[PDB]
Amino acid sequence: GAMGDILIVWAKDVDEMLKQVEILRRLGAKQIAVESSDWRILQEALKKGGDILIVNGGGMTITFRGDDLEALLKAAIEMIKQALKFGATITLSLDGNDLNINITGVPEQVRKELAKEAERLAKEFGITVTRTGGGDVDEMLKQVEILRRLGAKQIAVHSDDWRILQEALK
């Protein structure tokens, strides 16, 4: 349409993803790209008729959950200051009682440190945390091949994530 050709949906939950894709279709969206650290969410996006997927190879999504938003924000603020100082690109959103943090562009050693800090910050502020992605480069190569076999036409990667993975593959 006049506004563009492709809509990018960041999918943090399989049901919210399907709900978002349906709302955009009813608004007349023709092509929808789905981004997720969760391989099952990307597989569900293909099954629903999508074929452009945005993968997170070497990074991860940290999701803080709790009823006190100011406590989610205190945990997230610490993750942001540390991730930025290490040279990460970070994406944040609020989703019900969840604060989602997509982190790309840091090496595996730094990713492991950030994942540990996420567990500690969750304890400090009395909230829960889940990590999605951050698998080895070999498991990513496997999951990407599976998406292609399931009918993915275009797979996109953030350039910082891709450079970390090439440095790791070398």
Q: Which stretch binds Ni ion (CB under 5 A): 27-35, 80-88, 122-130, 161-169?
A: 27-35
Does 49 interact with its own copies (rule: CB under 8 A)? no
Q: Which phi and psi (to 5°) does residue 86 adopt? A: -85, -5
Spatial CB neighbours of 114, under 8 Å, sequence gap ≥ 6: 60, 62, 79, 82, 83, 86, 88, 103, 106
Total of chain residues touching its own copies, rule CB under 8 A: 50
- CB of 125: closest distance to Ni ion in angstroms? 26
Rounded to an integer, what distance in angstroms lies between the CA atom of residue 90 and that of residue 83? 8
Tokens of 51: 């074929």
- Hey, is 48 helix, strand or coil? coil
Does 12 interact with its own copies (rule: CB under 8 A)? no
Rounded to an integer, what distance in angstroms lies between the CA atom of residue 117 and that of residue 98? 18
Spatial CB neighbours of 47, under 8 Å, sequence gap ≥ 6: 150
Residue in 41, 42, 55, 122 binding its own copies, rule: CB under 8 A: 55
Contact positions with its own copies (CB under 8 A) in 95-154 = 99, 140-141, 144-145, 154
Task: Tell me the residue nearest to Ni ion as measured from the CB.
Answer: 35
- CB of 87: closest distance to its own copies in angstroms? 7
Under the rule (CB under 8 A), what is the footprint of its own copies?
A: 2-10, 20, 23-24, 27, 29, 32-33, 54-55, 57, 69, 73, 76-77, 80-81, 84-85, 87-94, 99, 140-141, 144-145, 154-159, 162-163, 165-166
